[model samples]
Target: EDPVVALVDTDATLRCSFSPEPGFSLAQLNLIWQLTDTKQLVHSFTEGRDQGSAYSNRTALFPDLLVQGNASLRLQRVRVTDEGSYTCFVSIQDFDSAAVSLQVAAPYSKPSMTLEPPGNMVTITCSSYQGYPEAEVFWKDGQGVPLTGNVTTSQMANERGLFDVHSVLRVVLGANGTYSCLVRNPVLQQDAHGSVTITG
Candidate 1:
């Protein structure tokens, strides 16, 4: 298999192809694909799936495409989380199988920050509204540097089946100052910045 690069804001397909030895058929073959993040199983043509998971919803086996020894995995609504190395493994009773690596690139979207105060504690939320695949959301200070604070992130699914991650940072804001929330995907090489204002 050959390596390929996919750009953000665009649809990309990871091709997996291999030739079987003579007199061998893929009918008895099985496929397995995985995403490193979340250690989640993306897809498997054989055996059932693990419910309430992301992979079970977005993966498929293309018998038409695979008939010609193409085990290509079709991933739609791609995003930054889709940026890591995707391994496509194929196996048959008595044949050699192979795996392929895909490189994905995504762009940063404008981030919005909101500050909600409850007593002495202030909650800062950063969100990347529209991102392909999924973006990593975190917090930073006004100096444009990452902050060492308690932060948590959650993924939301859009109508297009892509994901938007919301990051929440909790801190004690004794006085009014500026803070920043950073949203990014390491593989896509994209980052978004937002500011938070705290007032008593």
Candidate 2:
């Protein structure tokens, strides 16, 4: 079976099955499954063997008790890093062998901030370094109030799934003082601000 694909809020299941050539017995079966992201091995499951270190603490597997040729795996709490191709291997004393792939999708991490035109004219920038379909960025005030000014965002440079954004909030003040800037994206949000005393 081909690897299953799913989004962050969804679930994914990988199943592996095989039948002996003829003389092979179930006792001689040796099943091994490996999970990878971008070809990097992240977890492995094997019959009679403990779960591999990479996924030892993060994944779980169900034992096949009633089904004679069923070896299915279910992963919970899937994360962004879980997105990729997965391969499951099944062998009965070299009589049978095969593999399958699975893919998972999770939204990128929260966006970040960078200040341009630093001191006055208050330019508060928001960015999500890594994401797919590009993430959104906006600015707000320290009081959880969104900024109201000339706000703008940039287009993704390449299909590598990365993005950068910026927004400017104009402030009218004669003396320098401290202030805060709030940043947000669809997946997550954060705030970053500091006191800047400006003198005319």
Candidate 3:
């Protein structure tokens, strides 16, 4: 199954079996949505007031769709930890279960570049915040030349395990141009960048 892409803190819709036989609408049957990898119960229809500790009160179902046999799960405030596969089991159908993958991501903000003033050997710092998963940060000159060797990258989880990335680099004054900092989200295949011009 193709993974359902969801951002952190957003409502995610996981579609299960939508086309059940006309006669079986789950009024008499039972079904459970479970974490595929952990086999932990996420939510259930029969005596379904139960929810996982990690999910808390965040998992729910559509009352209207219950009778339609359109088995699905509504996951609210989705978290980075929610990234995994899930399975839905319908009692009436027995082993005829459906599965899906939840792909979670947190977007990185625009990079912020800082260059130290008045130094033959200058320090350049690049930073971005509020992102999930480790990010790839690289340095480049305004002339579109990639910079390497004297660069260091650091990361921290600030809120809800979202990351704050910091990349530092050292350069000699002989090369002066607009410096660039780009933050790339590997999983999401996205990038955001910032640039600072330096001629002094």
Least well predicted 10-residue stretch by lDDT in candidate 3: 47-56
TM-score of each: 0.43, 0.35, 0.50
Better of 2 and 3 by lDDT: 3
Off by over 4 Å in 3: 1-93
Q: Of 1 and 3, which scores higher on lDDT?
A: 3
- Which tens-of-lDDT digit does each residue in 163-200 have in candidate 1? 67788888776465678877777777577887866554
TM-score, candidate number 3: 0.50
**Model 2 regions lying over 4 Å from their true place:** 1-3, 20-27, 36-53, 65-67, 94-200
Best by TM-score: 3
Candidate 3 C-alpha lDDT tens digits along 1-200: 68999999999999877556666645455778889878888888774333343456788877668767676888989999888899998766433568999877888999887877733778888899988778888788877789653998899997589999999888775545677888999989789899888765
How far is 48's C-alpha from truth in model 3 (Å)? 24
lDDT, each prediction:
0.67, 0.50, 0.79
Q: How well does candidate 1 match the true structure, expressed as C-alpha RMSD? A: 25.8
In model 3, the clashing pairs are: none
- Write down the TM-score for model 1: 0.43
Error of 3 at 16 (Å): 36
- Better TM-score candidate (2, 3): 3
